[PDB]
Design a protein around this ligand. Sequence first.
Ligand SMILES: Nc1ncnc2c1ncn2[C@@H]1O[C@H](COP(=O)(O)O)[C@@H](O)[C@H]1O
Ligand SMILES: Nc1ncnc2c1ncn2[C@@H]1O[C@H](COP(=O)(O)O)[C@@H](O)[C@H]1O
Ligand SMILES: Nc1ncnc2c1ncn2[C@@H]1O[C@H](COP(=O)(O)O)[C@@H](O)[C@H]1O
Ligand SMILES: Nc1ncnc2c1ncn2[C@@H]1O[C@H](COP(=O)(O)O)[C@@H](O)[C@H]1O
Ligand SMILES: O=C(O)/C=C/C(=O)O
Ligand SMILES: O=C(O)/C=C/C(=O)O
Ligand SMILES: O=C(O)/C=C/C(=O)O
Ligand SMILES: O=C(O)/C=C/C(=O)O
Lengths: 458, 459, 459, 458
Amino acid sequence: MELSSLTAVSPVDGRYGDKVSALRGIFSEYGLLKFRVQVEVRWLQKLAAHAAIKEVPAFAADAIGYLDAIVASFSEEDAARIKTIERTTNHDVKAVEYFLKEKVAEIPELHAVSEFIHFACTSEDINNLSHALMLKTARDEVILPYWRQLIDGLKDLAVQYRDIPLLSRTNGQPATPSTIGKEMANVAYRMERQYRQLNQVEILGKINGAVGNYNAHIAAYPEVDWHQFSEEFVTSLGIQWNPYTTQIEPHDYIAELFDCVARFNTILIDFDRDVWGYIALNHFKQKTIAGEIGSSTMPHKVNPIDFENSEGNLGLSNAVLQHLASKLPVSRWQRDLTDSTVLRNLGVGIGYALIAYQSTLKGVSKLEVNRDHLLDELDHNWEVLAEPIQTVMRRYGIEKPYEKLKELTRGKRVDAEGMKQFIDGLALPEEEKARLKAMTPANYIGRAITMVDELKHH
Amino acid sequence: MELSSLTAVSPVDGRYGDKVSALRGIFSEYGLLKFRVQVEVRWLQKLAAHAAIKEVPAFAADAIGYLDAIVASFSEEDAARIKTIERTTNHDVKAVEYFLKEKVAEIPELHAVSEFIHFACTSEDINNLSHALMLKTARDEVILPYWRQLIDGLKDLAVQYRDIPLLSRTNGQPATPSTIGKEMANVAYRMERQYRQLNQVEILGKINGAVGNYNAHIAAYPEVDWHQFSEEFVTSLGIQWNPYTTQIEPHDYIAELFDCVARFNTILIDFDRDVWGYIALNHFKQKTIAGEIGSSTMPHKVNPIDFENSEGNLGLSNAVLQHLASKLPVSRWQRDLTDSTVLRNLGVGIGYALIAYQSTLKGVSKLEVNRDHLLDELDHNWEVLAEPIQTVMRRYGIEKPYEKLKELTRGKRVDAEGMKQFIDGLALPEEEKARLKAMTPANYIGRAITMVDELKHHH
Amino acid sequence: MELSSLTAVSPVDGRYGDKVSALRGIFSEYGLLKFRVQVEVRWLQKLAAHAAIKEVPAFAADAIGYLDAIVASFSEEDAARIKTIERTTNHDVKAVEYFLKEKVAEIPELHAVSEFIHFACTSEDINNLSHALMLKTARDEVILPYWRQLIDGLKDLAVQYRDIPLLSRTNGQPATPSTIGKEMANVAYRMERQYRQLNQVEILGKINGAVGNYNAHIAAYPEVDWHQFSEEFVTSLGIQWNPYTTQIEPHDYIAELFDCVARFNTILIDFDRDVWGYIALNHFKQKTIAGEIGSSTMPHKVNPIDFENSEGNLGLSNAVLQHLASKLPVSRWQRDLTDSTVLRNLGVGIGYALIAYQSTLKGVSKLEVNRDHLLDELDHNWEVLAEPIQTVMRRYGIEKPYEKLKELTRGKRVDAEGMKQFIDGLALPEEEKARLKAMTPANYIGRAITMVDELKHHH
Amino acid sequence: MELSSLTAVSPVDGRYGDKVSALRGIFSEYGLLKFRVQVEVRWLQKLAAHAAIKEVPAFAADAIGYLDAIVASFSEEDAARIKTIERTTNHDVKAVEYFLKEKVAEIPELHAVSEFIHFACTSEDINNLSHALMLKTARDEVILPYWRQLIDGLKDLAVQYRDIPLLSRTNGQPATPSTIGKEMANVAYRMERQYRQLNQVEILGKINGAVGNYNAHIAAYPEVDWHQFSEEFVTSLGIQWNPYTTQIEPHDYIAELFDCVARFNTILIDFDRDVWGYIALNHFKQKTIAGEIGSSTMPHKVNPIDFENSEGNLGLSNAVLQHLASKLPVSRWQRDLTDSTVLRNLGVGIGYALIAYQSTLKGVSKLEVNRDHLLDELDHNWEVLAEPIQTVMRRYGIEKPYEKLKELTRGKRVDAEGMKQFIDGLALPEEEKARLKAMTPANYIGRAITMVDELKHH
Ligand SMILES: Nc1ncnc2c1ncn2[C@@H]1O[C@H](COP(=O)(O)O)[C@@H](O)[C@H]1O
Ligand SMILES: Nc1ncnc2c1ncn2[C@@H]1O[C@H](COP(=O)(O)O)[C@@H](O)[C@H]1O
Ligand SMILES: Nc1ncnc2c1ncn2[C@@H]1O[C@H](COP(=O)(O)O)[C@@H](O)[C@H]1O
Ligand SMILES: Nc1ncnc2c1ncn2[C@@H]1O[C@H](COP(=O)(O)O)[C@@H](O)[C@H]1O
Ligand SMILES: O=C(O)/C=C/C(=O)O
Ligand SMILES: O=C(O)/C=C/C(=O)O
Ligand SMILES: O=C(O)/C=C/C(=O)O
Ligand SMILES: O=C(O)/C=C/C(=O)O
């Protein structure tokens, strides 16, 4: 069978292919080849612009334009030609070199310096810079914008549900109340920390020849400061310079990038699970679309499939991201080639994540808080007032406060009247007694609401 | 950009797409849908053949042929129709049901029992059986055949290199010799163990309604023995029966299946790495063709790129296989849907492995043992004879045998002459002294050759 | 600070030390050394009993008893002596050899064949056999017994709760009912599958010299069939023979063993989580004793801390088990020593699991099903009867059955009365209408109870 | 059997127990209890020092001293008492509370405010701050110093071997030369990046009650600004404040801490492997100790067991660190208790790492570079000069330079005379021809030496 979204082995290009279309122009073989062409061309232009390198005179305006067009117009047809050449070379980057030499052959000025294409370069000089550009593009144009959508989305939920009381669950058991909004706020805050970290991750690049010592460069141009030339070229591409490497850029920054993405994903997994649970408890109703089918056999079903889809894909994302993070930075001696094939999977780990981000956003858009249920549940759990009562008792020196409340509530059902009766028998100033009799599980929410309102201050 | 092998995000469908084409008809959405249709059709066919279920009379030959054709000729166009219907249902299995209902509408016999399609079934009854069929097919038609090629390949190398001496390396250091063939035999033996295990793994399936208690089945047909019905149906598909489940088949067998593939892949990583190193030591030269480029900058390079490609892909395979193996069997209460999207990746872990198997076979085809280097290295490591000498001394009661050889060789360079002189000073019977003076690093290979020759007698 | 359970870095030897005491005599350095001594002693004993090896005459009863005593009475003091000798050798197995040599010196018979201790052996010949003995002992005396307790425990719950109705949850939502007992039975069945698998795993061992070719053995005794000698010795230890290896036993069986324990642990995590949730839903209340504190701040709390402790430890167990399973079988060339230090952790992964098994059993002992809540919840979810109604409608040819019930219940609240009214308007034979009007969420449990009663007939 | 280093199940407390003794006072149950006592006491002191909280008057000098002594003198006997109390409570932190109440009972001033011990606190307020102190102490006093030793060690090797030529290996094959020192320098640089990152990781702490909303605090003291009180207390402990949490501190920073430690460990694994290989190639000899045994059967053996031990333990370390990093940040709703038992393993992942750090240092101390072998090997690989020759040809416009050199060397043995003969036939200016004939694989090292000398500038 020919490849199509229906026949694709992986769901990243298959069932969810339309959810990650932007990655097809970045992490695919086409994307890799596109970026390699960009790097090769930029290298030739720097050599030409470098006065000390007389063998490569400055290019005329039209020659520079011809070169820039090769970069900007790079097509699948161009990539297909490179692969055709690769059939002969069985070496992808050499095929890129030969492809570029073919392209400039018709332009005398360029053909003249044809043998300067890839001059003194090793394949990894081209590959690592290509990977850097792929990752930088992915982060700045795709990943961060989804993270911002998720963060803004959670904040909106926090504000929207700021004052909606919730019977908290610790150890899965009824506990001291909070508000739906506050529980949303906690997640936004965590996501924000990771967003800052991802944005601060360095994206490194290098260019220094075969084993990282500019051997070939120096042999031909011993008078040129290639260490300076290297830093200038890498930074000219918008990449941060990595001065010490072997044949390959070590890949530590890729682990740094993926580790933070995995942390964010983990926070999202936690969120997907919690909401799945709130929906199970009926604290949230789900918006329904006319025509849709919840269950093939149970007509009444309305399921949180978006949160579940996201949860599953986040696990897959982390499995791939984690493997790359831990495996890439280890390479035998000056390097073994196992990282090449692995690096063709940078978009895979990212892709599962993007699919999950969209699913979560989709699930969030269908949330309908159920205040009635939330409040009704709280009204059936007056035992949660045992904490404040004992704490107040502690304040006013009443003996064994915690112990007395434990005797009253642990393993015992106690309603409002019962809790109220206990308070009345306490040796406390009327003012405090009345203050205690005035609280309910629904209003025993502490600083929850204000916590939500102050989030914007962090 | 439209999807093509060039724009595909994953190299399983991209760069290596042509290496795993067989999986496109199995693990993809098209494959999933095709098997779902097969299961649905067979379910309807069993209901018809069941005399006690009179509302669905036995189907005549032409109707059975029409149903069989739906299964056999299932096309991408058919899959597209289901996807079109799914746009409305937002439920894939329900779209399959509607698809089939549309298909039988033109056959009165079949159209008359239209509402019996998916009768009493829950989506997972169809899904789990499809996954089982997908995995069984992949194992018997794809995985095992590659494993047999690797095993036979290693065995061929074992025989071909049965008597070629090798300076063994323990802790990376020169050690007691072996033969290239013996080192290959060890790997083939480990591979065979996993082969037998994978083949013995159970591929389970179930069919029992919404939560596993045949609730719906019994509500409509209380006089029918659905437990028996279930076992017959699952086994009729060539799948092994799993009588106890919630809404989903628990997936334990998937972990069992993936755990053995991972063990096999691990053995292969070990192999890829060892050969990469033997090539690094120049114990093997590499066959290459004119035109091929080793390095873009170093024209003299000839690299073991096939073994490296395999090694990298095996790591990826195991990472995906292991995630599925450990995550799938955990599902909240009667099931949470997180396993659905994950199960659409059964072929991904398998795909990375297939790519690796082919790369290794390619690498193996290019190996050329370098007898000259192997022997020359052995002739510069006569210190390895310290072990046999001390051992012989132990036998004949000579004092501090091991200790004496350690003082003589640890941290010291000793050639054939120096080792010979030492043996001469030993208080051993002439015959034993001669035997020791007759051995060399190259012939101090123990039972290596016979071990290789006897491999065929195992497994 | 001196080491004590209070200062121990790891909770396996610290807080939970008393929960895994049996492992101290197996996987610790003391245990490793004890088994090494056992293997060394048995090796010497076989050499003596082998008539062809005349330099080591058969041992008389008292000498055999003295050797057996070294093995049987091996103490921490003996272990300390070896560690003392190791301070000089910087090689543990060599220290064991010297230890034994010192021990036999007082027995002329044994002292006379002193240099035959460790004869022709490489350290791994002793190590791998010790690991095999450690794992076999742990499996047969520790792991399986806990697994049997869990399985029997789940089966007891299954029987005890066989007929207690439960509103099932799929996607976390109210679904077709089952029984508490049926949900327990499902787990017991999965556990039994892994139990059989773990019991069937092969525990392999080898003994063949420095690199696996009996080089040293053949150099001294070329007329002896060491391949046969090897198989006899390994099997005499109750271990299964692995004829092909490098310096180390490849460790594939360790992965096979650990892969099944991990699958079992995964099933248990699934269980711990489900029960944690059933407790959260108040389907089960928890037994607690006076004096116990649930929360330091919320006096009303009663938490399922036992299940939570188990769940956390199972994750830890699998993480260690999986690392060993995937890393151990890869060793550079004839072996690199990275597996030695790692193999000192065989008991760690097992320890986390043992802690978890005991915590779960403790949690189970405190469960008290809450029939009132389970039934009350079911009585507020009559919408689950939409499935059986539509299914019956399908049987009797009523049009758009599923679709009609969806419009009636999806996103809508429907009580017993509303469901009853709907059934009355259906064009079905009186008998079928009555049957539908007679069912309730609580009795719509299908074959749940019989499934539980038939569990005993499986496995 | 009773617990001893010989009977310990885990080698962290067993065979290598003496290698991690410092962790016994930090991550053990004793350490956890010690820190919990510290937090509880500090909390009581802040309440006393807080003027607005009149029910807890400022403490006299001797009372404060008595409290400080409880913290500073905390012993195993004290910890044993807490565990004895825990037998009754089956709740560790409550046992700590009761233990402290017992300790102050003899001091009237303290006994007077006995019920203010743990006032309004939830166990996790104490636990998370304890974990923060454990991790901060471990990083600043143990981990970073080992990393600094390793970094300084690699730098010393770099300087010591700065000019020692090495036949590089890419794909495991003879490649463009470098120097032993440069290969050491690359590793030091990578380790330094992680050191900076680990040092910059935030160590967070919180204190806000049952579910994070100061519910109990406000119920008793509605006039006190508990949000300010919280930030002050956490920062007073030297911990960074985490304002938004549920019952537990989310643990994201722990993942951040462990992820960077794992990255460092991975770099070290790569190093352990490379040196193991250099030793296998005989580029490094190993120092030998009189009396030691390399092999029980092969008398001549001298093995790099220290690097191997380190490699094995680094893998174990990462397995544990990774599990904690990915599992801890996920907790059901306001929290499930699975993280408590897991957090008792913070020292385990760290312990394996420390054992490995020491083993690597030990292995490094035994390295003896073998210049003779290194140089002899290079002198047998004149084919590596094919790169510079073709590059020079490229510079001077000689047709198909790379192609001509490939024909000459790919799959062919070419010695100095052969390479020299090829150069003589080139149409290049004598000056360049002589420059090429003057190089050897040993001096074709590019900027390697200078790269090493400039490391100190980064
Ligand atoms: N040392 C190297 N650096 C960069 N590319 C290489 C190196 N060695 C081989 N290659 C080529 O890199 C490509 C790797 O392909 P793949 O394994 O599919 O990722 C192959 O086309 C090789 O010919
Ligand atoms: N409980 C369930 N069992 C089987 N399929 C379901 C269930 N709940 C929802 N679905 C459907 O299964 C599909 C899951 O899609 P995906 O997440 O992409 O794997 C969706 O089309 C859902 O409508
Ligand atoms: N090739 C080998 N086979 C078995 N033991 C070895 C080997 N090489 C070194 N050893 C010893 O094995 C022990 C490994 O200790 P450890 O790294 O703590 O597990 C050390 O005492 C070494 O002297
Ligand atoms: N929600 C909670 N927060 C803090 N501690 C708890 C909580 N629930 C139970 N505990 C106690 O925490 C301890 C956990 O012990 P372990 O599982 O061994 O780490 C037990 O002593 C419990 O009684
Ligand atoms: O193609 C390169 O740039 C390098 C190849 C190699 O080192 O083998
Ligand atoms: O589609 C089904 O078969 C089941 C759906 C559900 O349980 O929600
Ligand atoms: O101690 C041994 O048995 C082997 C040691 C080695 O191969 O180095
Ligand atoms: O002990 C505590 O602080 C909290 C306990 C709980 O939430 O259950």
